[PDB]
Design an enzyme around this catalytic site. Structure first.
Site, PDB file in Angstrom:
ATOM      1  N   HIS A 277       0.822  -1.216   0.000  1.00  0.00           N
ATOM      2  CA  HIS A 277       0.000   0.000   0.000  1.00  0.00           C
ATOM      3  C   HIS A 277       0.847   1.254   0.000  1.00  0.00           C
ATOM      4  O   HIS A 277       0.608   2.175   0.771  1.00  0.00           O
ATOM      5  CB  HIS A 277      -0.988  -0.009   1.163  1.00  0.00           C
ATOM      6  CG  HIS A 277      -2.083  -1.009   0.991  1.00  0.00           C
ATOM      7  ND1 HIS A 277      -3.386  -0.649   0.725  1.00  0.00           N
ATOM      8  CD2 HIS A 277      -2.058  -2.364   0.984  1.00  0.00           C
ATOM      9  CE1 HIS A 277      -4.122  -1.737   0.591  1.00  0.00           C
ATOM     10  NE2 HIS A 277      -3.338  -2.792   0.737  1.00  0.00           N
TER      11      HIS A 277
ATOM     12  N   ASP B 148      -1.885  -4.748  -4.799  1.00  0.00           N
ATOM     13  CA  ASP B 148      -1.862  -3.669  -3.817  1.00  0.00           C
ATOM     14  C   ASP B 148      -0.439  -3.207  -3.498  1.00  0.00           C
ATOM     15  O   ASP B 148      -0.087  -3.007  -2.339  1.00  0.00           O
ATOM     16  CB  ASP B 148      -2.612  -4.054  -2.530  1.00  0.00           C
ATOM     17  CG  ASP B 148      -4.121  -3.937  -2.671  1.00  0.00           C
ATOM     18  OD1 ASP B 148      -4.844  -4.401  -1.760  1.00  0.00           O
ATOM     19  OD2 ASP B 148      -4.583  -3.386  -3.693  1.00  0.00           O
TER      20      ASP B 148
ATOM     21  N   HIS C  83      -6.880  -1.457  -5.585  1.00  0.00           N
ATOM     22  CA  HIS C  83      -6.452  -0.068  -5.618  1.00  0.00           C
ATOM     23  C   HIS C  83      -5.826   0.307  -6.955  1.00  0.00           C
ATOM     24  O   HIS C  83      -5.993   1.423  -7.421  1.00  0.00           O
ATOM     25  CB  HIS C  83      -5.455   0.200  -4.477  1.00  0.00           C
ATOM     26  CG  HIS C  83      -6.058   0.100  -3.103  1.00  0.00           C
ATOM     27  ND1 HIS C  83      -7.296   0.618  -2.788  1.00  0.00           N
ATOM     28  CD2 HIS C  83      -5.592  -0.473  -1.968  1.00  0.00           C
ATOM     29  CE1 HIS C  83      -7.565   0.373  -1.516  1.00  0.00           C
ATOM     30  NE2 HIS C  83      -6.546  -0.288  -0.995  1.00  0.00           N
TER      31      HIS C  83
ATOM     32  N   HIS D 140      -5.698 -11.652  -6.538  1.00  0.00           N
ATOM     33  CA  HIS D 140      -5.867 -10.634  -5.510  1.00  0.00           C
ATOM     34  C   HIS D 140      -7.348 -10.517  -5.184  1.00  0.00           C
ATOM     35  O   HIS D 140      -8.007  -9.568  -5.595  1.00  0.00           O
ATOM     36  CB  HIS D 140      -5.315  -9.281  -5.979  1.00  0.00           C
ATOM     37  CG  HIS D 140      -5.363  -8.212  -4.929  1.00  0.00           C
ATOM     38  ND1 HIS D 140      -4.355  -8.031  -4.002  1.00  0.00           N
ATOM     39  CD2 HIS D 140      -6.290  -7.263  -4.662  1.00  0.00           C
ATOM     40  CE1 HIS D 140      -4.665  -7.022  -3.208  1.00  0.00           C
ATOM     41  NE2 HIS D 140      -5.832  -6.536  -3.587  1.00  0.00           N
TER      42      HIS D 140
ATOM     43  N   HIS E  11      -5.411  -9.954  -1.395  1.00  0.00           N
ATOM     44  CA  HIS E  11      -6.390  -8.993  -0.854  1.00  0.00           C
ATOM     45  C   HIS E  11      -6.661  -8.988   0.668  1.00  0.00           C
ATOM     46  O   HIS E  11      -7.361  -8.115   1.155  1.00  0.00           O
ATOM     47  CB  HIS E  11      -7.708  -9.124  -1.630  1.00  0.00           C
ATOM     48  CG  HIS E  11      -8.656  -7.975  -1.450  1.00  0.00           C
ATOM     49  ND1 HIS E  11      -8.269  -6.655  -1.547  1.00  0.00           N
ATOM     50  CD2 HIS E  11      -9.992  -7.956  -1.210  1.00  0.00           C
ATOM     51  CE1 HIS E  11      -9.319  -5.873  -1.363  1.00  0.00           C
ATOM     52  NE2 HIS E  11     -10.377  -6.640  -1.158  1.00  0.00           N
TER      53      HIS E  11
HETATM   54 MG   LIG Z   1      -6.602  -5.698  -1.963  1.00  0.00          MG
HETATM   55 MG   LIG Z   2      -5.337  -4.674   0.334  1.00  0.00          MG
END
Ligand SMILES: [Mg+2]
Ligand SMILES: [Mg+2]
Ligand SMILES: [Mg+2]
Ligand SMILES: [Mg+2]
Ligand SMILES: [Mg+2]
Ligand SMILES: [Mg+2]
Ligand SMILES: [Mg+2]
Ligand SMILES: [Mg+2]
Ligand SMILES: [Mg+2]
Ligand SMILES: [Mg+2]
Ligand SMILES: [Mg+2]
Ligand SMILES: [Mg+2]
Lengths: 313, 307, 306, 317, 305, 314
Positions: F13, F52, F88, F161, F189
DNA sequence: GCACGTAGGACAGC
DNA sequence: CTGTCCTACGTGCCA
């Protein structure tokens, strides 16, 4: 046996240069005249208009005017007035500030024969008419001559400018007005007294230096009002006194050298009351003249940066 | 044994919309009040300021004013006035037009004790002060009650806005003014009467529709002046009569269809005096309404090119 | 054709450190200009010493510039030569004459002026010291060369010439070439006379600069010359001298009653409040102080002697 | 930047001042002025406010007068209006005497009162007065209040003065800081250091001298640089962010304190590093004097004190 | 020749006027169009004076195009210099400029660097966009450049500012602020400006597309693209500067007041080679008529009356 | 040995800026760069990244710099990298590009099959970007096509994911019975560490590389955050051949200060920390100013202040 | 009563 | 022979 006063153009409430002191000056000089007329106690006072300078004058002005003319009416001095340019309503239904004097003063828009002790003497007059309405006026004027045919002592009251006495503009020509003993006129702020027709024409002149011109007539004629006696069957200049009135002094200056600077200071020092100074001061003498600010009311001189080679004949 | 009049805010010489007719209207409603006050013949008339709308009011206004107060004074009615926001000088040496009434009227900036039949009664007041000088005023106000401590019937005259009765702005908070029997107030052009402290507070309200808003208060409460009796030792609402005065009616319109248009024509016919019309009229209905321009005082209505 | 020859105004000179005296100089100057303006000649030749200093008072400069502007605006061409007083001393220093550059031609060479309807040759140069006489001679000979084929020729200089001034002088009378008119400056007395088959002139100062010039004002008068030069030949007969009123000076020797009355008579006879100088016996001092209102300044020595 | 309005605040050129009796220094004063003038011509502002002391003397040298008149002519011909107030140096002393400012009468407006200038397309109020003494402070207050009176209904008001103000100059000063009314910009002169800071509901400024006139001005030259200000005054409010300071190249001064080989070499380095023959001043130890005498060709004038003292002075770090 | 170099700036990559896909694409296409010509030219150096991206965090596609481009330029052993524009400048401390992503192909200038080309040795200095407020700093920055360039003969300065003569309001520097350099590689001014200055020559490359409604006609008068200076010889002047112009989107101005001006409108609009952008003023009465040809036009956002 | 090894990492992230704190955005970066370092220390053959990588579709520039810095360093050490787009990183508007696109030169984005030949074996990889629950249908078809092409393969790895139904109650995109028999399930995920045998093989969620939501702390204490290290030397792989690399990251302390004890436990827990902790939970109004004494010892205080006098007595 | 500049006289010249 | 001293005094600031 008889006497009467011709005054006009007090311009009550005029505020020259936006100065408080000046608005006061107008009031004071007016009150000064009133005091003198009360001291004189003439039979009549002819006021040829512009008592007030504005159509809706300040309260102080109305207070003074009403105060004054009450004092006159209470002293059995009869007062006639014609409305001047400044006192003439513009909107329909609008009232003249002269209306406030209704109970002390006769506003003239026609004839009136006044019996004095012990004579009978004719007065006629009318409010300020425009150049536009001169035709209107001629009929009115002729009707005055008509009803005055058989009167020995006849006075005409008007608030207009007459053609020789005032270049352009003027509403009437001198050959427009009929034979009268005395012409009580008002719209012109310089003092004018002289024979006319088979009688004597007069402008009482303003009672203070109102507009930019009147400077020299102040030194040359003096400001105030006239006191005509009209005792005998005839009247001539010989029986007309000019009552002068002390008012704000104006000194004109042209400071270009050490001499003209000192002449200026002398004229200023010699003033009884802090003067209005005007004219020209050369830049080079400016800050040196600024030393007299305590001794001066207001300085309305043009400052000149120019170096002149002016030399006398 | 005693009765008196509380009037204020005539705003003499105000010339709404620069209209000749509106200036007359103001004169008319004032002169009506004076006639009605004369028909009443009260002992005192308390005037809480804004008599003139201007500091240098038109000559007709002054003549009407002087004649009116003369006519009152010659009938042995004593008149008290305090100067409103409008009658207060700006320059030092500038005089109030109220001064032209000095001979018929007591202009208050302190106390005065008046002897009636057969009582002795305390009146005090002062001119319009700004919010800025509230502290100054408190001193003044506290000194009034002090000089009134031993008096039973006491009336206070002021021309200010008081905090509950006018949100913003106001010069005094209601808890600013001391205990008096009656509060002769001015500066709020809508009628206000209600109990306060241990007595009764009043705003006489304007004697004509000065601003466009006061129109409905004319419809709802009616404009005029108050007639308080103050005969007994206590005074209450039951002893206060409100004299109304008919004045120029205003019509609000929002014509976008036949309905609002017909309602407009109905209200206009329903008017006693040629009304001042304002509000909204659709562009498309413009030439149709102009047929009533002779039947209407003035058209100050917004034209809407859409809705 | 007509032209004016003026010189030595000494603008901004402040004699006795007197305000009135600095004025006097301005005044007489402005007057010559007025008089020149009423005459409206074709040319004005100024032979230097316009200003008294290199850094003259602002008023003197202000007056000068106005004056020559007014002359230039009346289409009168003006030539000037730098006087001793108007000559820079440190390198890079400028002359106050420079401030007049737009109304006046500063001469350091030749120039031929076409008038209505004649054609006339003018040359001149600034003040040279005695030291540069050699230099100057060449310059003058270079003038004579360029003037051979010219009929009417004027020479402008600001020097002292040997006969006309005992000591000192920069040139000998036999130093200068033949010219029709010698427009000269630097001698404060009026000098006009025929010379080298032509006519030589010193316009003289326009006010009393030194106490020496006192009597020549009464005897000859101060102002300027107005030469016409209309005809083909010119002689003294065609030269008008314009006079100028200026400050009067009285000399005194009070030792008895006679000389006192001669003084008071002379002072009352004065048109303009006089400058008094000379000798006065101590015993007469407080008695003479009675006339200070009638006198500008008292520069007489007090004599404690018998 | 723009505008509907822009103007230059300059002052204290002291034209014709001849420091150290050096021709070179007299020239320097001239040159730097001309440079300011050139920069203003490249900038082309609408107004130039000059806060006095244009000339250093009442009767200035001819060259200064020519340079001055030339400058303000060239500005006036490019339609830049110039307002000026008389400085201490330009105020006549004997009665009837004229200021050299008078020679600029045709290119410049001399201020001793109010004036409203109509620009494109705004309307802005300017007022000023000649130099008054401490003695005439009373006289001055009345005048200053008279300005406050005549400017109340004006939005953009600039005050021009040539005085020293009390905080900005301890002793002496002619006015106290609380003497002057709210104006948008205080165009001041007479303090030869560059001063710009907010004041009242506005911004007060000293343009500062355009060259080193008196021996004191050294450090503010290094720290602020000499030249003039360029205010734009485009918007309704003005803040420092809208004031550009134009710097001016002028005669360099090096302060030296030669006491060892380092300080000597550092002196020679700064001097060799100079664009223009510097005025050297400060202290030079006696022992290093004749060694420094080698650089007389490289130096304009040496105004350093010679120190015979052997100090055992030592620093901590 | 033996040596040549390129001056470009203000591509404003990722600008999306009126939120149109086609507008953002136009900017892209025209940029890539400029890049194509630079590859056809094969110069020794490429100078970019800022505002490459429109924002500090531009869309990913814009970032893709740019990196792809300079990759293609760096792979030809062509050195590239850039200085940060107003738009590419960080706000938070620690925030990075997107230019940082180009470090592998590009030298970002905030000082001096001496580059040896074929076969000469030439001095380059420059710095990022400073604010008006920080002008003082800049002057000092500039003074230090002059110092390090005094003993150098060929000196180029790269800046992204508005200079007082070339732009009334606003500007960060006055023209007398910048020292004598051989070439003034400038940016932030979207109109083409090329002229001699001091002892050298000052240039604004101008924008590579019409960003504001103003730039329409300056494309016609000067042409948009970039400048191509050679600087092979000992002297420099306009004579040695070729300007490559680039074809871009046509803009039509309208003022329909009668049938005539309407006809003038139809004439100019039909004259467009590329799907036109229509703007200006339209009379109430004439609105519906172009809607017969509205399919032939991109968008009508002309002033609403 | 060995002949083969590879790394499974996900959910960094990058560019996430928790509590709008500079330090937190940095923390995310720091832990990521630390992983890359450990990966370089390891020198695995392949890197599987389960999406991600970035936290948004338009990540901050510092993040892009760091990411590219990392994968170049990985690609230059001859480590091939496979990635799938996370929730994302998937474009929304048509024509919008993924920030993953900027990494094309170091990484292979998977949306289909690819067989990578190692030393000296041949092994099958397939994967796809994040699909929504709504598009499960598409996905199942996609998945049958993956199982089909891997039938004749012995070593086959699946990259996804998504959230799978048992491993994440609500919500999830796929059911556990949706995915075919593969050697390894590289999943992403879900931010908690999940490793277990599944469909005659082994399923794994690598878990986030930092505490993204306030919950994951105790899962860090209890399981630890980082990435997995699979060898895949034999034909089959089991837990025995999976090493889990842990990573130190920002500590979060939960407080529930209601008495003198709870206050002291708070102070102890905070002092015990290696790095100025993120404090969260509840603090009674009465203890607020006494807790304010620890401001120097704390990164940020995200505890609710409770003025309420609870009769909480179990 | 003070201060300040200008004028004016004089002495020094490498 | 420019430069600068010295002394003297006019004129304005002032107390
Ligand atoms: Mg994810
Ligand atoms: Mg995530
Ligand atoms: Mg009159
Ligand atoms: Mg009149
Ligand atoms: Mg009120
Ligand atoms: Mg009211
Ligand atoms: Mg002489
Ligand atoms: Mg001479
Ligand atoms: Mg000064
Ligand atoms: Mg100064
Ligand atoms: Mg830019
Ligand atoms: Mg740009």
């Amino acid at each position: 046996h008889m006497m009467f006063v011709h005054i006009a153009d007090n311009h009550l409430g005029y505020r020259q240069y936006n100065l408080d002191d000046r608005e006061k000056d107008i009031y004071d000089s007016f009150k000064l005249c009133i005091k003198k007329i009360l001291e004189i106690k003439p039979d009549v006072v002819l006021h040829s208009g512009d008592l007030f300078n504005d159509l809706r004058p300040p309260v102080k002005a109305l207070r003074i005017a009403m105060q004054a003319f009450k004092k006159l009416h209470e002293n059995n001095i009869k007062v006639y007035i014609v409305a001047g340019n400044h006192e003439m309503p513009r909107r329909l239904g609008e009232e003249s500030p002269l209306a406030l004097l209704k109970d002390y003063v006769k506003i003239l828009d026609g004839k009136d024969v006044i019996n004095v002790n012990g004579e009978e003497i004719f007065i006629c007059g009318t409010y300020y008419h425009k150049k536009s309405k001169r035709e209107e006026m001629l009929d009115k004027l002729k009707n005055f001559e008509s009803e005055a045919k058989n009167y020995k002592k006849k006075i005409l009251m008007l608030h207009q400018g007459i053609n020789p006495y005032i270049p352009l503009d003027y509403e009437l020509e001198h050959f427009d007005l009929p034979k009268f003993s005395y012409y009580a006129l008002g719209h012109i702020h310089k003092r004018i007294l002289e024979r006319f027709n088979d009688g004597i024409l007069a402008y009482s002149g303003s009672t203070e230096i109102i507009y930019r011109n009147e400077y020299e007539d102040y030194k040359k004629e003096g400001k105030g009002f006239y006191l005509v006696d009209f005792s005998g069957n005839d009247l001539d200049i010989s029986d007309i006194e000019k009552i002068d009135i002390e008012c704000r002094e104006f000194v004109e200056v042209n400071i270009k050298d050490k001499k003209s600077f000192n002449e200026a200071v002398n004229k200023i020092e010699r003033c009884k009351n802090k003067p209005v100074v005007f004219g020209k001061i050369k830049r080079e003498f400016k800050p040196w003249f600024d030393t007299l600010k305590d001794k001066i009311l207001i300085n309305k001189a043009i400052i000149v940066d120019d170096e002149f080679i002016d030399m006398p004949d």
